[PDB]
Amino acid sequence: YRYTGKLRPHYPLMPTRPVPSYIQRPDYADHPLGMSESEQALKGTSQIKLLSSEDIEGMRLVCRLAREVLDVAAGMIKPGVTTEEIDHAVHLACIARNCYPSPLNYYNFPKSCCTSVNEVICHGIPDRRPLQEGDIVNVDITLYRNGYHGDLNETFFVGEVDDGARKLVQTTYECLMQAIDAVKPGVRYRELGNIIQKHAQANGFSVVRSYCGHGIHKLFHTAPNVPHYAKNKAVGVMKSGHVFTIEPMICEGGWQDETWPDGWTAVTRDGKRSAQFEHTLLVTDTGCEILTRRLDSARPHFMS
Ligand SMILES: Cc1nc(-c2ccccn2)nc(N[C@H](Cc2ccccc2)C(N)=O)c1Cl
Ligand SMILES: [Co+2]
Ligand SMILES: [Co+2]
Ligand SMILES: [Co+2]
Ligand SMILES: [K+]
């Protein structure tokens, strides 16, 4: 395998981290290949769940807890800290909140969160690599509590970063927020990609095509599929009670991705940097509720 940039995996990985048995587990947690039978039963269906009041309360809770866990990771971002060390702290923070870390054993994914440095678009596997001054790193968190999953991510700066990194991260965040601002009942899911690509393109960046936002509730990933690029064929119209993510991945160079031999790490084919931000959203009569928002601070971590 020819690596596309400077990043390499840093092995060995620590043995899988156990989750105490008192924490409620999703179906895939104990499947030998980490398959989710509840999800697979709906594979190829485009119908979107309308959440009940109980569902909404469940989503508010797990999304708030997921935010707390992302904030834990954010506080650890500094030169010399390994992504494995971030993952260990995330794992413990989930357990402390009586939550299962959703990525863990999801289709045999080996860790409790995804850490995506520089040219890694998404699904980076926490490993022994110390973060370096100038790096950008995304941490993508998902928690499972009482049958519900809550999902968010932010890109962080490691020490002082260059102008390109600042512009990339800022633009990606703006892309997410412009998309969120358009969410309300009656809007087609396919419209969000038009909004995101317009803003990315205006700043000389490209939009990843192979990975999309998704419905999330009792399932980790389900209908609708939410592409982030323009003129896509996403099926569905937003209705009050829909819960889904928007999670644009934006690139300095071209949009093309490839996967490392580990089967997970998605990287830019040109080795240039990529950034991502993500919220879980509930559609309401007036627009949407950002379930994974900060409650105590106005801005994402890269601005604070
Ligand atoms: C956004 C997303 N992420 C994952 C993933 C898997 C492991 C850890 C973190 N995230 N999986 C997703 N979908 C998978 C399929 C998949 C797997 C790997 C990359 C893309 C899609 C599914 N529905 O079973 C999807 Cl749609
Ligand atoms: Co994912
Ligand atoms: Co996520
Ligand atoms: Co997501
Ligand atoms: K990245």
Side-chain angles (χ1 to χ4, degrees):
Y1 180 74
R2 178 188 190 163
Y3 286 90
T4 69
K6 295 196 178 195
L7 209 74
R8 300 291 184 276
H10 283 54
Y11 300 139
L13 301 186
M14 292 187 275
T16 61
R17 298 192 165 284
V19 186
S21 49
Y22 62 80
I23 280 154
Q24 182 175 319
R25 298 161 80 79
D27 58 6
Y28 58 83
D30 302 294
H31 189 284
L33 297 185
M35 291 168 27
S36 176
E37 300 203 0
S38 59
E39 286 181 4
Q40 285 174 320
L42 291 167
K43 183 203 165 191
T45 67
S46 66
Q47 182 170 302
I48 307 162
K49 190 182 190 67
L50 290 164
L51 273 77
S52 65
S53 296
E54 196 194 5
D55 289 337
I56 288 159
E57 286 316 296
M59 289 300 282
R60 278 171 180 161
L61 174 59
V62 69
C63 286
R64 178 178 70 79
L65 296 175
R67 164 58 64 178
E68 294 177 2
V69 172
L70 182 65
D71 292 343
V72 171
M76 296 179 74
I77 309 296
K78 52 190 189 179
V81 175
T82 73
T83 49
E84 255 191 335
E85 283 166 348
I86 294 159
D87 175 85
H88 185 193
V90 163
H91 188 81
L92 295 176
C94 291
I95 294 166
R97 290 159 180 79
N98 281 268
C99 293
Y100 184 92
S102 308
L104 188 63
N105 203 47
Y106 187 66
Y107 292 82
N108 288 157
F109 186 81
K111 293 288 194 177
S112 299
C113 65
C114 302
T115 51
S116 302
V117 176
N118 294 339
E119 68 267 37
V120 179
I121 291 167
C122 63
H123 298 159
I125 295 169
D127 67 12
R128 301 186 67 87
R129 184 188 176 271
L131 293 168
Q132 296 176 9
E133 184 94 1
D135 283 348
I136 66 173
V137 58
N138 180 278
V139 180
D140 189 353
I141 295 303
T142 304
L143 273 60
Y144 182 75
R145 174 75 182 257
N146 191 34
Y148 302 96
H149 289 96
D151 187 359
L152 75 159
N153 75 58
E154 292 189 16
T155 305
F156 307 110
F157 300 145
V158 188
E160 299 296 307
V161 299
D162 67 29
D163 289 343
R166 299 187 188 275
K167 184 185 172 185
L168 177 64
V169 173
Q170 179 74 29
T171 302
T172 306
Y173 183 68
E174 290 164 355
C175 286
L176 171 60
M177 293 316 305
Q178 292 184 23
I180 292 175
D181 289 348
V183 174
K184 64 181 186 185
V187 174
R188 296 194 178 89
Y189 284 96
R190 71 181 186 219
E191 177 55 24
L192 301 172
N194 293 327
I195 296 163
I196 292 157
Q197 185 170 332
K198 189 186 209 301
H199 192 63
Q201 206 145 280
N203 288 277
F205 301 131
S206 61
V207 181
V208 168
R209 298 179 79 86
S210 300
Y211 296 96
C212 302
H214 54 93
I216 181 171
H217 34 78
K218 291 188 173 169
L219 309 183
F220 188 175
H221 306 98
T222 190
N225 189 66
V226 189
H228 311 290
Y229 56 89
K231 301 175 184 175
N232 66 78
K233 57 173 81 80
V235 174
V237 178
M238 295 173 204
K239 289 179 192 61
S240 187
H242 282 184
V243 176
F244 68 103
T245 75
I246 308 175
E247 55 185 280
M249 293 139 286
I250 304 299
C251 306
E252 286 186 308
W255 60 262
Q256 291 81 12
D257 64 288
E258 62 182 76
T259 308
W260 279 5
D262 62 25
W264 285 109
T265 306
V267 291
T268 56
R269 299 202 72 192
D270 64 10
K272 295 184 188 306
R273 298 173 292 191
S274 183
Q276 184 180 26
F277 285 86
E278 170 176 25
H279 278 301
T280 298
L281 306 179
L282 166 68
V283 185
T284 69
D285 293 347
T286 50
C288 82
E289 178 175 336
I290 306 172
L291 297 176
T292 47
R293 71 194 184 272
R294 309 192 67 177
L295 299 165
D296 61 336
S297 198
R299 313 211 178 277
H301 291 276
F302 81 94
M303 297 180 182
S304 331

